Every structure is written in structure tokens, then in C-alpha cells.
Design a binder for this molecule. Structure first.
Ligand SMILES: [Mg+2]
Ligand SMILES: [Mg+2]
Ligand SMILES: [Mg+2]
Ligand SMILES: [Mg+2]
Ligand SMILES: [Mg+2]
Ligand SMILES: [Mg+2]
Ligand SMILES: [Mg+2]
Ligand SMILES: [Mg+2]
Length: 1058
């Protein structure tokens, strides 16, 4: 028998327990209902509420029955409505036939209402901080708003509604212009304009361009208070034009642009339907606007961002508080040199990404089904047999599934008083007879291993000696958080690891103990990190932590305290250790890899994963992964597996994984198992091509990883991060930039082969074949299931690790300590520079500079001192000569000859790349390619009409356009002016062995006829020069066979030169 009421239940954002108070935190004028339960169901029950209002006893309120369920009756007591300031204290009670009363409480609530800033009454300039003394719209407080500069381009606002707290100092490099009606604060990067009556702030760039501004009607900034004991929420409101896009907010699965949505900063473990429910494991109260600013609300409490979700030209944040009147609202408006610089300034505030060892950037292999030594040896043999040189290996199903720090099947004499075990305390049996040996085999294969962990001590009621011993110790030492009544906090019964006791990661002694238990795994077993799963486990309004903080504040922070604790611990013993986790908040980026969680093997889930990675990127989480092709649901189709593999190879972290613990047939998302499950053998060569290409690009990828750590630039970025003004790039979620120079456009729609790619202004070159694409339009690229459109930006310098074959997709292995052929792929366009992180050679910075001078038929490269021999691959026509420090280097006729030479150059006719080999030197080397022009525009890659392609020796590219000999046929080119609007010479290379031919050429609609003289035979190519006038952007150059034209031609390419 009993009674029960608990006003906040588990304080879940999305649901309510059936015995809560509603609303949980009443405001003035809201009817207050108390839901109460009694058991068992019996006639003669009475349920009532004994209470006081402002210390005065009120008449008891009788509860009315609502419904019965199971063994219980549910009741509703209506306390009515209250006024701001009312302090209500109540006790709910239940009795049957006037007998023993059962009760809950007492519980107290303070009725609140909103107060807003009215006017600025005075401004005090303290040199490193500015205080705005304010009046309020209601109540008796004397609010103060403090302004400070974290940097000259980053403004910090700290509001003290009572005025009793003081803001923090910042930079002194500002000037103030204060008048009766307005105060303007200026730095070399910002102009902050503040009207005083009513108070209203506008933030502008130094040049006057508006970034952000408080909502037009003012009274935008407020706090929710009873006017005495508590402040429960804060808010601010801002004006936003219809076109403004909002990115970030942590890891979001529904959309990359949150305009129109109410975004909750609340970590949550949502299985599979994250997009549909709009939930996430990793929530950050930071967004970046394409209007060139970021906003960061500095608080771990839940916040709701209403992004034009209620009023079409308004966005607001509503931030929660635990009632403490001394907690100031603290937020930043962040500007910078560009959008990526905004993210960098945000990481200055919340923490830089920690560079991880290079092994983290190779392929990670995982499968929950791997649960014994024979599975590991088979996984390693399968990888080798299938030429899959991975670098990472994860074990999830490795432990006893009780303590989670002991190997499955291991025997030992249980320990009391939380004493740690050493390797020798165990007798290893069955599934893991030699864990150290098993780890040694993984290392021998060139891989590093991580073990799965959770932040909770299991307690499902079953008896298990060691776990029961650890629980007793943990409770006696206070290593758990407190439920608010002196007992250990336990995860709600219905959740994952329900009834389990969380380790209080805010308690250093608790963290030292918990980690001491896992110490032997690092010191003796030799592991390389932990896959720290979970952490979205803090519920309860009264849950209390060692740092004095409670549930509201700690829910979002807990996962990051947990993840960071393990990351730091592992790295303290093994400097190469890496963490792999899913949950966190601001600051998550300091502690390893984040994967997108539990999704299904579908194209819809693939789309959501990409959105998750792009939003996480904007939020400063750059080292991001996903379970390629999904970890559960029906096995992926060959098409999905291939599409996912391509994107995964061009993502920050590449990793396959699977959910099922013991399936038949295997559920591994490995390439060999994918061939077996789908029967499609072609999956293997396709996976190999992408894995090999990733390893060929490892030098470029790892330099990008270092740039994230140093400059805050995420590895994979949504298009508007690099092109915020470009209206075409605002909502793109099926393409992205990878590193500084590659535009990647994965195919994420089932059955799609015609892929739209938006190309920003500039010139983009297909990295696989040399196809040229002028920017400023959306192109349609034919991409079969094995193809991934990837383009290099104009001026790109891309370091690669190549084999003697020198093509992308050739297996260089997984050696992380040396290069095979260190190569720099270059797409010359003006003067460009690149800073290479030569980690193989001590981590030295190598500054490479390229100077394109096609107007004078030259391209120069300034190669700094290098420890290794270097190969340049420069996109251009064939040079007449190549010099290194003024001396000519020998021309190699074949690739074999090039590989034999110690210095020299070779021209790759298929790729239109000039290879130049330079020996290792403790001094700079000046390389100059002479007689070179912009690489040809291959006829064979143009837009063809009623004509097809074919492949006579001596041609450039893959062949030429053939059967161009009848009216209505056409070959169209998208051509770029090499140096802006001007007259140029267009070389037309063709063969006409049977007769003189003529074609009519249109240059941006302007017609001219050209004559192509007979060649000796079809094996004799010839080039005719044609004067043309090109302008900025894409020049449409059409070659038509019209009424008055004649003869057959084979058409190889066109070259644009001075
Ligand atoms: Mg900065
Ligand atoms: Mg197994
Ligand atoms: Mg080691
Ligand atoms: Mg304590
Ligand atoms: Mg869509
Ligand atoms: Mg120049
Ligand atoms: Mg060699
Ligand atoms: Mg050709």
C-alpha cells in the first residue's frame, strides 16, 4: 500500500512520468495540477493536498480520480493559479477509510514571471570592460549588462539581473563614444551600437555591415523570476531577415539549416530515428550564421533556440537555470576573417581539437559479433587475404558483461574495497586465453586496438560477486552522484543500463578509482584506447554531483566529463591512445573521435549521417565518423555499400561496424562479408579503390587534421562555410569540401546516377581524369555506382603518397612512418601556397609555393628543403623543358625511365600532368616548367551531340571525339579565361586524313568559321590556332557542323593560350 507524487519525475525533456506536477515550474497565471498515485486499487480512497501559500495554511485540496492502470489509481489535484512571488509548499497524501495516511513531500515552488531590460541609465567604461546600468520593465532589480572583448572580433555579454555580480575583463583595444541616446563601442573589427532608451543592441563589422541585432521592439533581453528567491530562465530575441541560414547546434540529423525549427540543446540517446525525432547525442549551444557571425551561449543548462520558428523575422534563445540568482547569462557574438575563423574563435573559448596520431585516420574495422580470439585472427587474416590494410580495430564484445573491465571467461579471486587487478591476477579461459597475445597480433598487423566502455556500474538485480563488491565500495566512498536524498543516483529503470549507478566524473577520487580498475588494460594488455559509448544518462531535477552542480546543469556536461576523463587517462599511459565516442557538448572536440551513433542500412540513414557530420563540423567537432552503410537493419545492398564506401573514404574518420552480437550469416560491414552477403564480387575492387585512394591522400588528410587542431578549420565542411555569400550553397547537404581544396559530391539517393554538383566561382578539376569544370553553376555528372565526383579547387597543392604507378587508387600499404613516393599534385592558378605537415620527418612544416605564369608559358615551384625525394604532378600541357635551379633536367620518355632517374621530368598524356622529380636537399630548389600552357580541354570530356567518343596513337587524354562528320553534330566546351577577360588563342588539335574540313565555332554566341587542313593520314595529328575573345566565368565554346561545313574529323582537344 502507498501513495506517490514527485513533481519533476525524471525531469525528461520529452516525456513525463504519470505522477508529476504540471507545469513543472509554474509561472504566474498558469493552473497547477498535481498528478498523484495510490495503490492498490480500492474503494474508499481519499487523496488530498495539505499546503501553504506564502507561509499561510490553505484549505486542503481534494484530488479527483483520473484513471486506473495496473495496481494503481491516478488522481489529479488542482491547486489553481498563482501570482508572481507566491511561494507554495505542499504535501500530497493518501488514505483508505480514514486509516494510515501515506504522503509525499513537502515540495516547494516559487511562481515566476518575466522581467526585461528597459533602458540603459548610465555607462561605466573600466578600460577592459564596460558596465551598462539598466532599468527593468517590472520588479525591483537593478540589472547590469557587462561587455568585454574575448578578442577584438569576439564580443562577450554577461547579464546580472540583480546587479550583484560583476563581468570579466577582456581586451582593452576598444574606443567608446557615449551620448545621451546611444553608446557605440568600436574595435578594429567590430562596431557595437547600443540605443539607450529603450535598450537595443546591434553588432556590426568595422565597415558598418550588420551582423546581428536585438529584436526591433526592444525589451528583448529578460529573465524569469519570482522577484525574490529565484531566476529560472533567461532569454534574448533577435531580428533575422528571411534569407538568413543557421548552421551547427552540435550534431543534427534532420537538416543542416535550422531555420524554422525549435532546436533543443539536450543530449539524448535516440536509437535509429534521430532525424525524425530531431534528437541527438551531441548538442552544443553554438550556431554559425551565413550572415557572418556565430553565437555561443555559455552554459551547460538546456537551452531552446527558436530559429524563426514562431515569428518569421525573429530568433530567440531560452536558457534554463537552476534558480540560483547568482548565475549570470553569458553569451558571445563571434566574428572573424571568414566562417572558419569564426569556428576557430569559438574553439579559443571552448577548447581546441587535440591532434590525434596518424593511425586514427586510416580504416577502422569493427563488428559487435567479434567476441573471441578466433574472430580476431580470422578478421586479421580476412583483411590480409583481401588486401585491406586497415589501421584501427575495435572490440565491443570483449568483457565479462558484468564489471566491463575484465575479459570474458577470465577467472580470479574477487577483490573487496575496490582494489584494482593486475594482469597476473587472472586465469584467462575460453574465448580469451591470451589477451596480451591477441593484442600483439593486432599490432603485428599494423593496427591499433580500442575497447568498448560505459560510464555506469551495471546493476540489474542479478548476483555477481565482483560487481556487487564494486557497488558496495562505490556507494561507501560516495563515488556515485547523489539522488538528492543521500542515496546513490541510478539511471531510470526503463532506460539503457536502467538501475545502474553512474560514476561521478566530476569527483577526481571517483575518476582515479574507476580508471585504476582499467589501468592493466593499458600498462599490461597494451591497448590503444577506449570506445567510450553512452553518457546520456543524467536525469532528475535533484540529482547532485561532487562539484555541487545538479541534474539540469550536468546532463549535457556529463558525457564530456566522462569522455575527457578516459581520453586523458589513456593518453597518460599510452601517448598514441585514441578515444571513440558519441556523446558530448561544447568542449567535446578536445577528446577524440565522435561517431554518429546507431543508424540503419538505408539511403535515408546515409543522408542523415551526412547532415550529422556537416553540422558537427560547423560546431567544432571535426574528427567525425559514422558506421559506413549503417550498422543494423537488413544488410546493405551492394549499391548502398558502394556509395557509402566512397563517402566514408572522403570523410574525417573511416570506419565500418555492425550491431548483432551472434548472427548467422555474419553481419560484418567489412568488404569481404559484403561480397559474401550480396554475392556482388565487384564490391571488393571498388572498396579497395577508395581505401587505397584515402591512403594515397593520407598526407593531405593528416595535414587537414593538424589544421583543425591549430586553426579550427574542420576537415569536412558544408559549402556555406567556405562560400557564405553564395545563395546556391546555403542549403546543400549532398556535397562538401574535404580539406581546403577538394569538393566531394557523394551520391546519397537510391538508384541515382545523374548527380548534381554545385560548383562555386572558380575552376574545378576532376581529380580522377583531368576533366575541367568552370564554376558558377550546377553541373550534372554521370556517376555510376563505382564513381565519386571529386574536384580540386583552382590553385590546389595536394600532397600524396604514391606507388611507382603514380595513379590514385594504387595500394601504398599502411606504413605510417615513411613515404613510398611523396608527391605534390598541383593545379596552377595564379600564386598559391601550401604548408605541409611532414609528420614522417619530425613534424616539420614544409612551405610549398607555386607561381602560375601561363601568359609567358611558365609554371614555377619553390620547393623547400625536404628529407625525401619529391615528385611534382603539375596539371599542364607538355613542357619544352624543365629546370631545377637553372639546370635542365632530363626528359624521360616513359614512366619506367622516370622511375629509374634520380632527377627528371615525364609527361602523363592521359592525365595531362607533368611529373618532375627532385632529389632530397637541405636547401630550397627552384623548379621551372617552360613552354607550358593550361592543360587541354579534352574533346573527349565535352558535351557531345549526336557524336560519340573513340580511341590512333598520339592523342592527349583518354582518346578523342570521332565520327564528327555530319550536320547537326556538335562538341561543346565549358572554357575558362586563363587570366580574365581578354583575347586569347585557341589551339584546335585534330586529324583529317581524308580531306580539308570546316566547322562553325560559337564563342558565347558569337560565330566564326574555322578551316582544318588535311593531315598526312589518320595517324598524323595537326593543330590550328584560332583567335577568340573570352570573358569572366564560364565561356560557352561550341563546335558545330552546320549547313555549309565539310569533311570528317577526329577531335582530340583544345588549348587556350596567350
Ligand atoms: Mg581569432
Ligand atoms: Mg563471434
Ligand atoms: Mg603501446
Ligand atoms: Mg559527495
Ligand atoms: Mg532532403
Ligand atoms: Mg601572377
Ligand atoms: Mg623509387
Ligand atoms: Mg584527347
Amino acid at each position: 500500500d502507498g501513495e506517490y507524487h514527485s513533481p519533476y519525475g525524471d525531469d525528461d525533456l520529452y516525456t513525463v512520468q504519470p505522477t508529476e506536477r504540471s507545469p513543472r515550474d509554474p509561472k504566474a497565471g498558469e493552473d497547477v495540477i498535481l498528478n498523484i498515485t495510490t495503490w492498490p486499487i480500492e474503494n474508499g480512497q481519499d487523496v488530498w493536498v495539505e499546503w501553504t501559500k506564502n507561509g499561510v495554511a490553505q484549505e486542503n485540496v481534494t484530488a479527483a480520480y483520473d484513471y486506473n492502470s495496473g495496481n494503481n489509481t491516478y488522481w489529479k489535484a488542482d491547486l489553481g493559479k498563482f501570482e508572481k512571488g507566491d511561494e507554495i509548499t505542499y504535501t500530497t497524501k493518501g488514505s483508505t477509510n480514514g486509516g494510515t495516511a501515506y504522503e509525499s513531500g513537502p515540495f516547494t515552488f516559487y511562481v515566476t514571471d518575466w522581467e526585461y531590460v528597459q533602458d540603459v541609465t548610465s555607462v561605466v567604461d573600466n578600460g577592459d570592460s564596460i558596465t551598462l546600468n539598466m532599468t527593468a520593465t517590472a520588479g525591483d532589480f537593478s540589472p547590469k549588462l557587462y561587455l568585454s572583448f574575448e578578442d577584438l572580433d569576439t564580443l562577450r555579454m554577461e547579464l546580472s539581473p540583480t546587479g550583484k555580480e560583476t563581468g570579466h575583463a577582456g581586451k582593452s583595444g576598444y574606443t567608446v563614444e557615449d551620448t545621451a541616446e546611444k553608446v557605440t563601442v568600436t574595435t578594429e573589427d567590430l562596431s557595437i551600437e547600443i540605443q539607450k532608451s529603450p535598450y537595443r543592441m546591434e553588432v556590426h563589422q568595422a565597415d558598418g555591415t550588420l551582423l546581428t541585432s536585438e529584436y526591433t521592439t526592444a525589451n528583448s533581453l529578460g529573465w524569469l523570476t519570482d522577484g525574490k528567491n529565484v531566476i529560472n530562465q533567461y532569454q534574448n530575441n533577435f531580428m533575422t531577415p528571411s534569407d538568413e541560414a543557421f548552421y551547427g547546434f552540435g550534431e543534427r540529423y534532420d537538416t543542416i539549416n535550422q531555420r524554422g525549427k525549435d532546436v533543443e540543446t539536450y543530449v539524448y540517446n535516440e536509437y535509429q530515428d534521430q532525424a525524425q525525432t530531431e534528437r541527438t547525442y551531441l548538442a552544443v549551444p553554438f550556431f554559425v550564421s551565413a550572415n557572418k557571425y556565430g553565437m555561443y551561449v555559455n552554459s551547460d543548462f538546456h537551452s531552446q533556440f527558436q530559429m524563426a520558428s514562431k515569428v518569421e523575422d525573429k530568433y530567440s534563445f531560452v536558457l534554463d537555470n537552476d534558480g540560483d540568482m547568482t548565475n549570470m547569462l553569458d553569451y558571445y557574438v563571434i566574428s572573424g576573417k571568414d566562417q572558419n575563423d569564426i569556428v576557430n574563435n569559438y574553439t579559443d573559448i571552448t577548447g581546441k581539437t587535440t591532434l590525434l596520431p596518424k593511425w586514427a585516420f586510416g580504416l577502422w574495422m569493427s563488428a559487435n559479433e567479434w567476441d573471441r580470439e578466433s574472430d580476431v585472427s580470422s578478421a586479421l587474416s580476412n583483411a590480409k587475404a583481401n588486401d585491406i590494410p586497415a589501421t584501427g580495430f575495435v572490440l565491443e564484445q570483449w568483457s565479462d558483461e558484468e564489471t566491463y573491465y575484465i575479459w570474458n571467461n577470465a577467472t580470479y579471486t574477487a577483490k573487496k574495497n575496490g582494489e584494482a587487478f593486475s594482469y597476473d591476477d587472472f586465469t584467462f579461459n575460453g574465448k580469451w586465453t591470451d589477451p596480451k597475445g591477441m593484442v600483439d597480433s593486432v599490432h603485428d598487423a599494423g593496427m591499433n586496438i580500442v575497447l568498448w566502455q560505459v560510464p555506469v556500474l551495471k546493476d540489474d538485480g542479478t548476483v555477481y560477486e565482483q560487481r556487487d563488491n564494486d557497488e558496495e565500495y562505490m556507494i561507501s566512498q560516495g563515488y556515485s552522484a547523489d539522488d538528492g536524498t543521500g542515496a546513490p543516483y541510478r539511471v531510470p529503470a526503463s532506460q539503457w543500463f536502467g538501475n545502474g549507478i553512474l560514476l561521478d566524473f566530476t569527483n577526481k577520487d571517483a575518476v582515479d578509482w574507476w580508471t585504476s580498475q582499467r589501468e592493466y588494460l593499458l600498462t599490461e594488455v597494451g591497448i590503444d584506447g577506449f570506445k567510450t559509448d553512452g553518457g546520456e544518462m543524467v536525469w532528475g531535477r535533484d540529482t547532485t554531483f561532487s562539484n555541487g552542480e545538479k541534474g539540469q546543469e550536468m546532463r549535457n556536461r556529463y558525457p564530456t566529463d566522462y569522455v575527457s576523463s578516459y581520453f586523458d587517462f589513456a593518453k597518460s599511459i599510452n601517448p598514441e591512445a585514441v578515444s571513440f565516442s558519441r556523446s558530448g557538448t561544447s568542449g567535446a572536440q578536445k577528446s577524440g573521435i565522435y561517431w554518429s551513433g546507431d543508424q540503419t542500412s538505408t539511403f535515408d540513414s546515409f543522408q542523415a549521417s551526412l547532415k550529422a557530420g556537416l553540422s558537427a563540423s560547423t560546431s567544432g567537432v571535426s574528427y567525425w565518423a559514422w558506421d559506413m552503410a549503417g550498422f543494423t537493419g537488413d544488410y546493405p545492398t551492394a549499391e548502398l555499400y558502394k556509395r557509402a564506401t566512397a563517402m566514408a573514404a572522403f570523410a574525417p574518420i573511416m570506419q565500418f561496424h555492425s550491431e548483432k552480437s551472434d548472427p548467422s550469416p555474419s553481419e560484418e560491414r567489412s568488404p569481404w562479408n559484403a561480397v559474401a552477403r550480396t554475392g556482388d564480387e565487384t564490391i571488393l575492387p571498388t572498396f579497395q579503390k577508395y581505401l587505397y585512394t584515402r591512403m594515397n591522400l593520407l598526407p593531405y588528410i593528416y595535414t587537414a587534421a593538424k589544421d583543425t587542431a591549430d586553426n579550427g578549420k574542420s576537415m569536412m565542411r558544408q559549402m556555406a562555410m567556405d562560400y557564405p555569400e553564395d545563395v546556391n550553397a546555403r542549403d546543400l547537404d549532398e556535397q562538401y569540401m574535404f580539406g581546403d581544396d577538394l569538393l566531394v559530391a557523394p551520391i546519397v539517393q537510391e538508384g541515382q546516377t545523374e548527380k548534381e554538383v554545385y560548383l562555386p566561382e572558380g575552376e574545378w578539376v576532376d581529380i580522377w581524369n583531368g576533366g575541367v569544370h568552370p564554376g558558377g553553376e550546377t553541373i550534372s555528372y554521370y556517376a555510376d555506382v563505382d564513381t565519386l565526383p571529386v574536384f580540386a579547387k583552382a590553385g590546389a597543392i595536394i600532397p600524396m603518397n604514391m606507388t611507382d604507378g603514380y595513379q590514385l587508387g594504387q595500394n601504398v600499404g599502411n606504413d605510417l612512418k615513411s613515404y613510398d613516393n611523396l608527391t605534390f599534385r598541383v593545379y596552377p592558378s595564379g600564386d598559391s601556397e601550401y604548408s605541409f605537415y611532414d609528420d614522417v620527418n619530425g613534424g616539420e612544416m614544409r612551405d610549398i609555393s607555386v607561381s602560375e605564369d601561363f601568359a609567358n608559358e611558365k609554371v614555377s615551384v619553390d620547393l623547400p628543403a625536404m628529407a625525401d625525394e619529391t615528385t611534382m604532378q603539375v596539371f599542364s600541357t607538355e613542357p619544352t623543358s624543365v629546370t631545377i635551379d637553372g639546370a635542365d633536367v632530363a626528359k624521360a620518355d616513359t614512366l619506367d625511365a622516370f622511375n629509374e632517374a634520380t632527377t627528371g621530368y615525364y609527361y602523363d598524356t592521359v592525365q595531362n600532368l607533368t611529373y618532375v622529380k627532385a632529389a632530397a636537399k637541405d636547401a630550397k630548389q627552384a623548379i621551372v616548367l617552360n613552354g607550358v600552357n593550361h592543360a587541354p580541354y579534352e574533346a573527349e570530356f565535352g558535351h557531345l551531340t549526336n557524336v560519340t567518343t573513340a580511341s590512333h596513337a598520339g592523342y592527349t587524354g583518354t582518346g578523342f571525339v570521332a565520327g564528327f562528320d555530319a550536320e547537326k553534330e556538335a562538341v561543346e566546351f565549358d572554357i575558362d579565361a586563363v587570366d580574365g577577360a581578354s583575347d586569347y588563342t585557341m589551339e584546335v588539335r585534330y586529324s583529317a586524313g581524308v580531306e580539308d574540313a570546316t566547322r562553325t565555332v560559337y564563342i558565347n554566341g558569337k560565330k566564326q568559321q574555322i578551316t582544318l587542313p588535311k593531315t598526312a593520314n589518320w595517324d598524323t595529328w595537326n593543330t590550328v590556332e584560332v583567335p577568340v575573345t573570352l570573358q569572366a566565368g564560364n565561356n560557352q565554346v561550341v563546335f558545330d557542323f552546320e549547313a555549309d561545313d565539310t569533311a570528317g574529323i577526329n577531335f582530340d582537344h583544345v588549348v587556350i593560350k596567350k
